[PDB]
Specification:
The structure is a homodimer. By secondary structure, chain A is an alpha/beta fold. Chain A contains 5 helices and 5 strands, in the order E-H-E-H-E-H-E-H-E-H. Chain A starts with a strand and ends with a helix. Chain B: Member of the two-component regulatory system KdpD/KdpE involved in the regulation of the kdp operon.
């Protein structure tokens, strides 16, 4: 009944998502994130890139070798080329700051229903 | 105690690490090779119980089969029926296409390892 969300990083977000009736798990490296995503099968991956960087794109490609779980990317800065890169790599959505928790949550719901 | 030996032929570091962690977690010893040639060399010196061949190949299989009956499982980005048929006919024992499920790969490894 409750949706399993894995956050792959690099506290308020986890709190708000749990407030929206989700179980939240956190992975604090991309290596750990890959291992956990492929092995533990959460319902959704939130990839928090912080500053837009290439190691995020390789991560998405690596994950897509091993799983079809929906991935939503969050980043601090809006760079169009990185959104295009990430989405083509297999990601399902991408929000850059500034964004609202309301919109994020709405986008999570879209991703879950289409799966 | 008891432990099977798996040789992984894979060029990507991230996947090589992932697979090491997952296979060692299932009680396997893991050897790795970053190219096909080194893979053949590792197949000769390590006498592995099993080889996971991460493609992008047929020639590697054909060469190996002239001196070794070790089980080979292919992981490929290609899902082309033609490619699967070619690898298996060349001597591969199994073939998975992306996205591989780690749980299924592990079950398929268990199948290859049951000897008689």
């Amino acid at each position: 009944a409750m949706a399993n969300v894995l956050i792959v990083e690099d506290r308020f977000l986890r709190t708000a998502l749990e407030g929206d009736g989700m179980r939240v798990f956190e992975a604090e490296t991309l290596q750990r994130g890959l291992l956990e995503a492929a092995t533990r099968k959460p319902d959704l991956i939130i990839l928090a890139l912080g500053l837009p960087d290439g190691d995020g794109i390789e991560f998405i490609r690596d994950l897509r070798q091993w799983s079809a779980v929906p991935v939503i990317v969050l980043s601090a800065r809006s760079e169009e080329s990185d959104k295009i890169a990430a989405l083509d790599a297999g990601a399902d959505d991408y929000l850059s700051k500034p964004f609202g928790i309301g919109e994020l949550q709405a986008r999570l719901r879209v991703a879950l229903r289409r799966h």
